[PDB]
Design a binder for this molecule. Structure first.
Ligand SMILES: */C=C\C(=O)Nc1ccc2ncnc(Nc3cccc(Br)c3)c2c1
Length: 308
């Protein structure tokens, strides 16, 4: 808002990233897994390297550098921070590797081993991450499942600050995750993130279905105006769905608050089988920390790699 933002933006040398492999791409960008050895430290940090696609048309470097600016400003266990950037031809953004990828791809992949505890915790974790953003007064503007990453099955962080901005501040478009006032009057606010949260939750609750599958984005705003919302997912009690529905209220101040959402989901997560009904959800076991590659006795996660 008006407090000096004294985040350190750290510059990293091409020579500090041993090993490299492609992890994802889509002309929207390219993301690589790799290793980073801070020079003069005996630590090997597993990182992802993002090198936005658009050749170099400065119009790009402008859109990647804003991202880093945001990603360098956050510090919370449920938000991904920027580790540093590397300058070379185009700009590379470097951050902690989330070894299990996007939460969206994860639910799709594990739709049969995902327990109620896991889903509801994720909801608590995301709300936490998002409430943090709200405190730093950031409006994420693109909260979705595709934009939550998995460090371990029990720890998610929010990412992708391409479109993030300050509440008040002036300035693809994902329609199916957008609040009504955001499709009509391009009003964005913490409360519109709430709506998208609602949608993210619906994605998890449906193990990664596509919102309004049939419908094309061109006539979403029309539908929502009529009062139609996403259906209630099969595993969802009315209690859980009712919270989803509350996020999708025309009157934005009537919508829950990430701080409220943390509490409500937190409550539920003490009795997960009472709020989510999942076929044979009991001894639902999930993998855990991390392995691979040659020498790795010096491997340190980003979360333990701190610098003054
Ligand atoms: C599901 C696609 C995806 O996002 N994969 C993925 C896996 C791990 C990972 N780790 C760290 N960062 C990202 N994405 C990312 C987004 C913005 C900036 C940066 Br440096 C990285 C991923 C993505």
């Amino acid at each position: 808002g008006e407090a000096p933002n004294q985040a350190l933006l750290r510059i990293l040398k091409e020579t500090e990233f041993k090993k490299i492999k492609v992890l994802g791409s889509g002309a929207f960008g390219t993301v690589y897994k790799g290793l980073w050895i801070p020079e003069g430290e005996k630590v090997k940090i597993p990182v992802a390297i993002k090198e936005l696609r658009e050749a170099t048309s400065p119009k790009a470097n402008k859109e990647i550098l804003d991202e880093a600016y945001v990603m360098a400003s956050v510090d919370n266990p449920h938000v991904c921070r920027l580790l540093g950037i590397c300058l070379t031809s185009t700009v590379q953004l470097i951050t902690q590797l989330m070894p299990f990828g996007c939460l969206l791809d994860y639910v799709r992949e594990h739709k049969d081993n995902i327990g109620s505890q896991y889903l509801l915790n994720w909801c608590v974790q995301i709300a936490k991450g998002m409430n943090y953003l709200e405190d730093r007064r950031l409006v994420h503007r693109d909260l979705a499942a595709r934009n939550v990453l998995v460090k371990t099955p029990q720890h998610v962080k929010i990412t992708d600050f391409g479109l993030a901005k300050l509440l008040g501040a002036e300035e693809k478009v994902p329609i199916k995750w957008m609040a009504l006032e955001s499709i009509l009057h391009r009003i964005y606010t913490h409360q519109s993130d709430v709506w998208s949260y609602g949608v993210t939750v619906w994605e998890l609750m449906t193990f990664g279905s596509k919102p309004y599958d049939g419908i094309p984005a061109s006539e979403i705003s029309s539908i929502l105006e009529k009062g139609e919302r996403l259906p209630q997912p099969p595993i969802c009690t009315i209690d859980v769905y009712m919270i989803m529905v509350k996020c999708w209220m025309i009157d934005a101040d009537s919508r829950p608050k990430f701080r409220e959402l943390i509490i409500e989901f937190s409550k539920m997560a003490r009795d997960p089988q009472r709020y989510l009904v999942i076929q044979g959800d009991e001894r639902m076991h999930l993998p855990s920390p991390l392995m691979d590659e040659e020498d790795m006795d010096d491997v340190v996660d980003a979360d333990e790699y701190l610098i003054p």
